[PDB]
Each structure stands twice: as structure tokens, then as C-alpha cells.
């Protein structure tokens, strides 16, 4: 008896989405945080910086 067979034809151009966006966003946030931290330094008491 005839059965159900799915038939997909043609391809739509594009890339997979969703996971990539999340990862990129996370990376950007981490980079920004890292940059800010690098910009700041602390000199503790009794010390002096040149």
C-alpha cells in the first residue's frame, strides 16, 4: 500500500542560525569586559607607581 514518504526538493540558501548568534554575542561581551579590566590598575598602600 502507498505509504507516506517525505520528499524535500531544492535547497534554500542560508546558514544555520541561532547558535551562532548566541556564541558571537557572548564572545563580544567577554571581550569588552576583558578590555575594561586591562585598562585599570591598582597601586596598594606603601607602593608608588612609575
UniProtKB/Swiss-Prot annotation:
Top-level taxon of origin: Eukaryota
Subcellular localization, as worded in the UniProt entry: Mitochondrion inner membrane; Cytoplasm; Nucleus; Cell membrane
Induction: Expression increases approximately 3-fold upon entry into G1 phase compared to other phases of the cell cycle. Also induced following inhibition of mitochondrial protein synthesis by thiamphenicol.
Tissue occurrence: Expressed in myoblasts.
Record note on modification: Phosphorylated. Tyrosine phosphorylation is indirectly stimulated by IGFBP6.
Domain notes: LC3-interaction region (LIR) is required for interaction with MAP1LC3B/LC3-II and for Parkin-mediated mitophagy.
Similarity comment text for this entry: Belongs to the prohibitin family.
Subunit structure, interactors included: The mitochondrial prohibitin complex consists of two subunits (PHB1 and PHB2), assembled into a membrane-associated ring-shaped supercomplex of approximately 1 mDa. Interacts with ESR1, HDAC1 and HDAC5. Interacts with ZNF703. Interacts with STOML2. Interacts with ARFGEF3. Interacts with SPHK2. Interacts with COX4I1; the interaction associates PHB2 with COX. Interacts with MAP1LC3B (membrane-bound form LC3-II); the interaction is direct and upon mitochondrial depolarization and proteasome-dependent outer membrane rupture. Interacts with IGFBP6 (via C-terminal domain). Interacts with CLPB.
Protein name: Prohibitin-2
UniProt source species: Homo sapiens
Gene name of this polypeptide: PHB2
